[PDB]
């Protein structure tokens, strides 16, 4: 599947916001 990270308040360059991960946490997944 795709790679995703649960980051605090931001997503890294290239990561799309897939969903919310927590209150202060975003669920970001690299475009590539």
Strand content: over 45%
Radius of gyration: 8 Å
Number of strands: 3
- Put simply, the count of helices is 0
Strand adjacency order, main sheet: 1-3-2
Distance between the termini: 11 Å
Q: Secondary-structure element sequence?
A: EEE
Let me know the largest β-sheet: 3 strands, antiparallel
Q: Tally the structural domains.
A: 1
Overall spatial form: globular
Subcellular location: Secreted; Cytoplasmic vesicle, Secretory vesicle
Family: Belongs to the alpha-defensin family.
Organism: Mus musculus (Mouse)
Function: Host-defense peptide that has antimicrobial activity. Exhibits activity against Gram-negative E.coli (in vitro). Probably contributes to the antimicrobial barrier function of the small bowel mucosa.
Keywords:
antimicrobial protein; Cryptdin; monomeric; 3-stranded antiparallel beta sheet; mainly beta; 32 residues
Characterize the structure shown.
With 32 residues, this protein is an all-beta fold. It has one domain (1-32). 0% of the residues lie in helices and 50% in strands. It contains no helices and three strands. It has strands at 5-8, 15-20, 25-30. The protein has a three-stranded antiparallel sheet with strand order 1-3-2, with no helix packed on it. A hairpin with a 4-residue loop joins strand 2 and strand 3. The termini are close together.
């Amino acid at each position: 599947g795709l790679l995703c990270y649960c980051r605090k308040g931001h997503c890294k360059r290239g990561e799309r916001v897939r969903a919310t991960c927590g209150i202060r946490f975003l669920y970001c997944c690299p475009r590539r």
